[PDB]
Write a protein that binds this ligand. Sequence first.
Ligand SMILES: CS(=O)(=O)Nc1ccc(F)c(F)c1
Length: 366
Amino acid sequence: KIPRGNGPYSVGCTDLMFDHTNKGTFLRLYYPSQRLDTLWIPNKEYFWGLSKFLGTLMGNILRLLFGSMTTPANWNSPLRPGEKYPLVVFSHGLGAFRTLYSAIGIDLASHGFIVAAVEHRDRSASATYYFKDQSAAEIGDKSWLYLRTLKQEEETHIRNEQVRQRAKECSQALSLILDIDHGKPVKNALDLKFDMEQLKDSIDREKIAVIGHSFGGATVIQTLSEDQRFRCGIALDAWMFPLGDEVYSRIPQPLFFINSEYFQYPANIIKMKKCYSPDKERKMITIRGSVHQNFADFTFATGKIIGHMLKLKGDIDSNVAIDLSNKASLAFLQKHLGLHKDFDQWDCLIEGDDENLIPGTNINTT
Ligand SMILES: CS(=O)(=O)Nc1ccc(F)c(F)c1
């Protein structure tokens, strides 16, 4: 029940791992393509990891419920040729992994973006895998890495080291895609029926953005601070705790905060406002009635009553919420990447001009 893209392009999806180690890049790619058959959560170990994240055999139950659920993109469909596409690198939240934000990835793709959804190896993912050597990769002998749980004494330090690794992973993902764009040969550690040589000369190398949710929102900010190739960033309900104090004044690129209503709190909002400066471009909106999970795919995976019970759904309808976030995002991207599309029709959303939006936030700080 993950919504199809609202844009004119049809959408393909594939996975890329290169190199095969846990120091390499692992990403899910959404792209304009030339069957809506992509497996949403493709391995049992992801369900085990989700169970550990939830602190709960619970894993096998999740598996039975969601294990064959699909997401509306055409698996390994060829790339739509004849044009250069802007690129979004997307960063997932704590306890997530690369496949859980397909509602966003597929909608951006359907509007003509290539979206690289990275899977982080910083031990923030519920689960991820790699191969210990080429021989392991050849027979698909995966080595799994589960979420690390932290002592309270550890949190400050380890979360910051993690957000630094995440930013390095977004930069490495970008460097890989750009290298491929100029013809670098890559051997996908996953043996999939999509030729990465398709991506040669298909990226608009000047129109690069980073987007992310929660832990991924802090990753947006660390990445912008560290990598000037990214031209703008969109932080979806950023969890600001991982960031060091020094970074807040070191973000030159335009930055858009799109918040849920119920996730936010003063300690977090204050850090967002520390990013502000008269000489820099900053916007913020809050989606009325929304919760933290409105930005991820599980908001579409259950019915309304169960969803509200488990806080996967807010008072606002899930499709309406994600549509608002996606349209405001597209308008911001058009403005600060210099796109030649008609997304500026939603410029009003950036300013929070809608029944279901608040300009800035309703939380007040000094
Ligand atoms: C708390 S979070 O939203 O940032 N990460 C997350 C963790 C598990 C999920 F199933 C999911 F959809 C998202």
